[PDB]
Symmetry: D2
Subunit: 120 residues, 4 copies
């Protein structure tokens, strides 16, 4: 059963590792895997902008580097801990590993990935 | 640099590879200038252009575990052979490793500065 | 909005598709707000993460031909059936078309705003 | 074809004026000679999600295939002031697929082979 406060705290903590000197907008993310472990990532920008990696990219990389599984929940936050909605690219990434019932943290209550990326 | 340890770690992480479209798993391990080792494996996607290389995982893990500069990288395929990073990954690595980063290669490691001239 | 013309131009351009890795060719055509039509096809790469969707070609062509906003898009597969853009491409299109951009679909076109909510 | 470097730079310079780069403010234009003689062009297109940015060379490669394919023979990439630029690593890998090691890239001293810009690809 999803501990949203754990996920947000983890996403806020990992945001400190963000490499975002171009945007000056650090982002952290934390996701609950179906075995119950949490994987994290932070954004990593590049001088060639189109090589930039979103925090959710880090999450999916760590998912598999730590043995795989399915994503159940995700929190993405700015430096100040405000929830953020994944970009379109990240919605497609996350859909591969979590499907439509993956929950994404949002101030009003979580959103299902299926609603954030219809007709996947 | 402990090349055997980096190769061992890259081989270990390659078992987690998510590569059902290419069926070409890859594992990568890098030494950070503070002594720690960070790892990644490739993660493909039905939209091919969203695929992440093992090296993208290494760079993500570098920063999620507190940043630093990369000193040495070993990438390995499923046969156990060293793999040269693709161009995208060379550019990625250059940002965090510069030209003196060493990449595992048969016979002896190569400098990233030679792999990506005029960066 | 001549959906027939957009679909035929998308089918035409799809014959130029470079998709030897997936064997899944895609063509796309978009009406720009000044009435002209810009096109693209998919272009894959041995490094899968470097693959370009047809819609990336549309967006590149939009700007290389002087810019504008996108009004309507048709994407087609090998059978000439409409395809929904991947999420990356939805974000791409949103930058240049916003929520009212129409995307061809069986039975009737869909708004980008519904395909990519909370943009 | 005989490579007309002047044509390729002029064409890259022209297309650079259409670059969509409101996040970096670093516009880039590119023009490539295809093996059938035609020139294809591209400019960079950035995105609010930085990692969705497309390089001028991505435009070049999309245009190549939208216009019937072939192999790239020469490329000129220019900044907003018309000065030559070297493609980024991603773009070297892209271009390698469509031009191989003998693709020439414009550079102030004289062109460079992609083979030298991307060894052991
Ligand atoms: Zn994203
Ligand atoms: Zn790579
Ligand atoms: Zn796409
Ligand atoms: Zn590039």
């Amino acid at each position: 059963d999803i501990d949203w406060k754990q996920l947000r705290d983890k996403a806020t903590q990992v945001a400190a590792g963000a490499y975002a000197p171009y945007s000056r907008f650090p982002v952290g993310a934390a996701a609950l895997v179906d075995d119950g472990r949490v994987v994290t990532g932070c954004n990593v920008e590049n001088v060639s902008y189109g090589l930039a990696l979103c925090a959710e990219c880090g999450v999916v990389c760590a998912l598999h580097a730590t043995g795989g599984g399915r994503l159940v929940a995700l929190a993405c936050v700015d430096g100040r801990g405000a929830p953020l909605m994944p970009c379109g690219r990240c919605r497609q990434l996350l859909f591969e590993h979590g499907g439509p019932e993956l929950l994404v943290d949002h101030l009003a209550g979580p959103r299902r990935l299926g609603d954030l990326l219809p007709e996947p």
